[PDB]
Design an enzyme around this catalytic site. Structure first.
Site, mmCIF file in Angstrom:
data_model
loop_
_atom_site.group_PDB
_atom_site.id
_atom_site.type_symbol
_atom_site.label_atom_id
_atom_site.label_comp_id
_atom_site.label_asym_id
_atom_site.label_seq_id
_atom_site.Cartn_x
_atom_site.Cartn_y
_atom_site.Cartn_z
ATOM 1 N N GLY A 1 84.850 -25.015 -3.780
ATOM 2 C CA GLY A 1 83.967 -24.620 -2.696
ATOM 3 C C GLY A 1 83.789 -23.130 -2.602
ATOM 4 O O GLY A 1 84.443 -22.378 -3.328
ATOM 5 N N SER A 2 82.957 -22.706 -1.650
ATOM 6 C CA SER A 2 82.654 -21.282 -1.425
ATOM 7 C C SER A 2 83.833 -20.398 -1.083
ATOM 8 O O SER A 2 83.756 -19.221 -1.304
ATOM 9 C CB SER A 2 81.524 -21.117 -0.395
ATOM 10 O OG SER A 2 81.915 -21.581 0.884
ATOM 11 N N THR A 10 82.087 -24.058 1.996
ATOM 12 C CA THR A 10 83.001 -25.221 2.183
ATOM 13 C C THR A 10 84.270 -24.969 1.364
ATOM 14 O O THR A 10 84.206 -24.251 0.386
ATOM 15 C CB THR A 10 82.310 -26.535 1.714
ATOM 16 O OG1 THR A 10 81.380 -26.979 2.706
ATOM 17 C CG2 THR A 10 83.300 -27.641 1.483
ATOM 18 N N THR A 11 85.440 -25.378 1.847
ATOM 19 C CA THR A 11 86.625 -25.221 1.012
ATOM 20 C C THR A 11 87.536 -26.437 1.065
ATOM 21 O O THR A 11 87.809 -26.991 2.122
ATOM 22 C CB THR A 11 87.467 -23.959 1.263
ATOM 23 O OG1 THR A 11 86.638 -22.807 1.135
ATOM 24 C CG2 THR A 11 88.539 -23.826 0.205
#
Lengths: 222, 154, 222, 222, 60, 222, 222, 224, 222, 222
Positions: free
Chosen positions: I140-141, I1-2
């Site tokens: 996020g990732s 998620t970003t």
């Protein structure tokens, strides 16, 4: 530690930082991580000064061993295979913690198109190789930062000079975001090392040329 | 097939010693010594002795000053240290005498090549295999003089 | 324990403490950890007091073995490689707890510049080596304190005497901040050992001349 | 990260770096770790960007709370005890990995001798305190490097200016040897923060002055 | 090639013995003896005997 | 169990207790732990009745073995090396719990000064040795008590007789503070064993002389 | 289980109980644990029945084998060493649960004094052997009880008959306090086994003689 | 990683994606997982993406080595048996995490009916093989999505062209539901690779063709 | 998620992707992760799945709750503190795997300078906050990729439009290098969500404007 | 999956299902698990397909190999022994999870009574075999359901046709209660496979005869 490599029209350039760490402690500031392995190749290993100089030393011996025994150099595909074998033979020791991931840059003298004859090959834990078709690649603790930098700067690469600049800037961006990668030390006069390879062979880029590019990057950012 | 076997074994030996110690730890004396020991064992252990005559030559390292060393190793393992020239194979005496006379210590490349070719002729173009151990090269002294360059030389 | 080594103009000096500890307890006050290994080298080992003599005895045998066999000494690069191999061959036993990290000091009789012919080489767990460009180095439990001391004192090094002094001061600083490193014992008359190497070879510095430097450092800090 | 504190004649100075890290990644560049907690005290905590503000914010509230309830400030001994209780109350959470070690700098307005009224107090994991009688102290990942630098430079401390310079230099020396501690960033213009406390109270040393002293340590080493 | 082989084997013997016991424990008599046993074996079992004559000397 | 050894002018003396325990239970009262290994050496091993004799028996055989094959005895250094090898060859078995630490006492017939020709050598787990310069040494569960006793009594050592007395007193002190070391049993008539070595060789000290000394230590403390 | 052994004037006697247990349950009432191994020795083994029963057999073979091969029997010291090696060769299997601890009783035909020519040797887990000067020894789960009994009653041993009587009483006492040791079963007619060894050799003591002694011990305590 | 294979009248087609991942991160965009192993076979290997070239290289050598030595190609069953042994010989290394499951596509010259000569064989962890009798198969992290796509699309496969197009669409669908499989990158111009095998042998389908196919799918699904 | 957030002159913009994943499987394409929490703030959560809607909902209730009770909005620092308390109150559940790290974007209506009144605050596992002085931030990732993209593109931010463009491009770059972040889906017409906050309040950027920016970025890279 | 076998007068019939599962997922619908291994035997394997596929092929090779070498086939007992041996050999691999349990059906051409010459042999994990006297047997995840079906239906077996019906009904019953066993698929026309063995040898039952039986069973239960 971070090692970068990129293709420019007529060749390839490989550059690496000079830091060495023992946890948080800086254990070295002068480490050479990129070595010319034969007339048309160079290897960069993300790691300690010895496991970078001993791997490059052995590979260089393997390549020249074939050349003397058979009269001709190994093909680039052959050079890749030999390196892959060396890495695979270190899988048993890589489960302990002694991991060494190499990045190979080279110029295929037997390629059809001299403009795109530069080659970049990366290796994974298992000894698996991948010939990079994207133009650039990086290995080490700051590789994601360096790859993301080159992604934005690669369009500015038109020759050897601009390529070397992008390489040095990528390494700068790596050190800016990763404490394990050393940035240019203007106080001690220590800068990243680089190798440039074209149709005339592999050449060590002089310290003075990198220093000039480092200062330009620094002056451009303040 | 017999001397190429020996050539391969020597490269095998040299590369191993240079890796176990360091590049500057391999010498012509060392290689001539090991060829003497190998040819000596073949002469004694094997059914048929090797029908070969070998020459191991060494030049000085870059920027260093030392006179070239030339070694003749024969079929039985005998090793001789020659200071000027080595002649092997075929009719050796006419070629050895044509050299002992037309000799030139510190001769040029162009001159030494002519002094040599003629001697070869006495015994008996692209009918030649020429090469040098060029003391002036940074590391790898061995350089082949082929085709047009060879032709240019003549 | 702590071992230090530094380069001075025309040579190199190596010195080491005399302490041995089993946990908190002091088990040795007379331990010798630095040995002359050939005419132009010396090794100091950190790990165990007993090991240092054994590691040095084997390496000395290996070096003289080659010299007798081939009639000339190994080149300095060769001496490094043999030590690196010895250390790598003790990787299996180092996973148990029997770790032994050596520090090598030497004078390269075949170097261009006799002023900077002194050499310091350090080794890591893996058997990896690094020739030091920064002038000094140290290994052992008090190495950080010693290196930080030498960082401030190195500019004062100019000859064999000043070099040996900084080396003894570095060792003093190590013992001051690390209980596993032994400081000079004026009561029993036990002082750090040292070796100095220049173009005339490796010579053991006399106990009396280290005692003089220790008395001097102590009075300088009172 | 590193925080230093030293006593000079008539006061105390505390300084801290601006770096923050997640693993090898640099996650913060502007982090403030040193805060004025009352008119005569300041705390430096080497941890997260907020573990410094949140600990300091609570302690500042506790000290002021007492003053408004009783009409007078707590004795310096009382300030130490309150901080010790706060740290001890975070022992259950320090077993998980949330370790917060504070360093307290202060001026005891009720001390006999105004020259030696500066106070440095350090805390351990358990919530144990120690008033420093060596003149200087440091906490964090670069603390050993900073304490070893101050050990050689402390004798040059005779006033507030020389005291601050030694502190900045100690921080510089820590950054030089510890990748988790950030050195002065001349490109972005970010420098260590400092607080100076004397009989006139606690004041935030302006950037301009730490910046000038940073360029001087740089210009001097080069 | 034959006596150099023997020279090398003697150095190999001497260095191993010194390491195993002590340096003061390697002697000329011992080295001469190792050579006699080695020459004797070669003479007896190898295809060709070594055309060599060896001298081992020791000083105080 | 405890074994002690000390140098006196003209020789060395070694002595050891007679207890053997299986946890808390006394399993032996007549155990001999000190054995003459050759004309000029004796070994004492910290442990059982048999895992002491077996070590001594093998070592004795080895020394004699060399003397017969070579016609001359091994040098003292050679005797040490052989013992070090024996101990190192038992490292795999020492990880289970079969730890055997020997103490070697000897007289170097080839030493320059006959007064200081006595030699004491101790070994650690790894098979590492240390020649003692300090004058005395001890191994075993009561070694700390015995070394601390000798520290205070060593100045009273001036000849063989006084040296033997100090040894017995050290062992008395070891048994007084360590339940695993057996004190002189006057009821059964069992006393520590001892060996004394000078220029005339190694001789077992008669039980009657040690009994005389044990009686005198007991009356002196009542 | 329990096995006892004691010296009397002119010989030695060894006796063992007949019980066998699988946990709590009684698996055997007829088990013989004492076996004549040669003309002058007897072994009793306590531990797992499978290794022990086999154990006497292997030892008997080794002794006899040497005698036929060399013409003369092994010395008593030799017999001990062979048994010690056998036990040591079973250390790896003893870590699982297959522990076999033997007790050896013998008459040294080559001893100076025929009155004290009886010998008792005990072995520990490691294969370590001890000779008992006390005159009595025991092994097994009831050994402590039997040894204590013997200590009280050893004075009464004046000849073979009284020696045998004490041995049987010690075993009676072992069974009285240890459920793993079987007492004399008068209902089934099963009694402890015994071997008596003097200058005339080793002979199995008959059942009726032991029954007469067991009945008298029972009458004496009732 | 997803690799698909399907039989069409007269042959077989095999296609694979180009993605490589390290955890969430995309480590490669140009990985090739499908290789021609001899004149009539192709292998696609899923997982340990760098190693796919290596497994194919050794298998190709074994097949050819036999062919040169004996003067004839191995039977298809022989080809299957060799590949099964190679996989079985890698069970020890697969327990660590170095798992490599191959998918084999081939054309049997010796088969009675040329139209049904195409073959698809899949392998499991243990080195066990299965000759697919249903017309299609897939391996890798997106295989379930790819097999479910082909289940609805296979009926429209009637020749090499439509077989290649169902394969590209299956791969596309897999990339849609699985992040570890890369869909066609129109920006960089990187598309899945494919091999088509019929009576005339194994041929690499040109990037041009897989490209026109992908664009016809993607550009139309999008606003284009 | 970003989730990304950046400051522009006169405001702040926050944008987030729409992807949800279960291991490698894509479990959602329409996830809203950025929510307006009050008139001048917006929170974006890189949290397991949809927790963000529960989280943002509770924070919005809290902010609104204070407002109704006190008649005035909480201060931005107050808003930050409340969010920090919420995150800290979720540390016990974050150890299991239920990690939820929020990113806060806001416009301080009470700030001196309206041009730099935009605020970005990030939170760590412990509940620690940090105000961003650098201009942008991401969680996020795919945060590293997004931050490295913004580093090169931030200089192009001059207004609200150019700010939204750089946020969308950063999220494009995040999705390009991170499989767990979803790029713009032109097929389904799903695009990243965004909120823009200036002196006039927080407003949801319309899907259509994000779509035009996405197509322009796509067109620019081909 | 399930495999059934039963004796009918003058013969034996073995049948197996076609399902293959990877956890809950159906991985195969056309798997053949029953194979003719020689003229008079057939094997059915349950467990791991990789193990299963290999076992039949190898066993068949083994039986034929013997026959060609010796000129006669192995006895039925020998055939059992060979199979049993193969199974034991696979035990080390069965501990991992590669469990393969075979069921053997055969006709003993050398049996006295041709009516009861049918043979069914089952194997356990250890490689142990058992010849069934009850008339039927089953292996696999649905074996209990199949055996309980045959228990009620076996009285109806009067010939090869009725025995094949019972076998197919048993497999139907297995699939009805076990999701890992596949029932007959009318839509795809996939049915269980079977082998029937009598005095004329082993032969594959045609798909069409099995299909008629399945429909009858299906019609009978509707």
């Amino acid at each position: 530690x971070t090692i970068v490599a990129l293709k420019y029209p007529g060749g390839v350039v490989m550059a690496g930082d000079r830091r060495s760490t023992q946890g948080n402690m800086i254990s070295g500031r002068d480490v050479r991580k990129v070595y010319i392995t034969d007339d048309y190749t160079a290897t960069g290993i993300a790691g300690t000064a010895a496991v970078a100089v001993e791997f490059a030393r052995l590979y260089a011996v393997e390549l020249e061993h074939y050349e003397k025994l058979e009269g001709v150099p190994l093909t680039f595909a052959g050079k890749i295979n030999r390196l892959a074998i060396m890495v695979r033979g270190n899988l048993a020791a890589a489960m302990q913690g002694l991991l060494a991931l190499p990045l190979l840059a080279g110029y295929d003298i037997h390629a059809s198109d001299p403009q795109s004859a530069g080659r970049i090959v990366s290796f994974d834990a298992a000894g698996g190789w991948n010939i990079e078709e994207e133009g650039y690649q990086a290995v080490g603790s700051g590789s994601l930062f360096a790859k993301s930098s080159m992604k934005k700067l690669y369009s500015q690469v038109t020759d050897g000079d601009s390529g070397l600049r992008v390489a040095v800037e990528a390494l700068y961006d790596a050190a800016d975001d990763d404490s394990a990668t050393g940035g240019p030390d203007l106080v001690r006069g220590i800068f990243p090392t680089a190798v440039i390879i074209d149709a005339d062979g592999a050449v060590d880029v002089p310290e003075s040329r990198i220093a000039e590019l480092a200062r330009a990057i620094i002056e451009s950012r303040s | 097939n017999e001397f190429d076997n020996l050539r391969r074994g020597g490269i095998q030996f040299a590369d191993t010693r240079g890796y176990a110690y360091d590049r500057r730890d391999v010498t012509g004396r060392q290689l001539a010594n090991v060829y003497a020991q190998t040819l000596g064992t073949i002469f004694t252990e094997q059914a048929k002795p090797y029908e070969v005559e070998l020459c191991v030559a060494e030049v000085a390292h870059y920027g260093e000053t030392k006179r070239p060393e030339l070694y003749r190793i024969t079929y039985d393992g005998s090793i001789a240290d020659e200071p000027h020239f080595v002649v092997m194979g075929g009719t050796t005496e006419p070629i050895a005498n044509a050299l002992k006379e037309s000799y030139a210590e510190n001769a040029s490349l162009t001159d030494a090549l002519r002094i040599a070719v003629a001697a070869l002729r006495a015994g008996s173009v692209a009918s030649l295999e020429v090469a040098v151990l060029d003391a002036n090269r940074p590391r790898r002294a061995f350089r082949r003089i082929t085709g047009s360059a060879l032709q240019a030389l003549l």
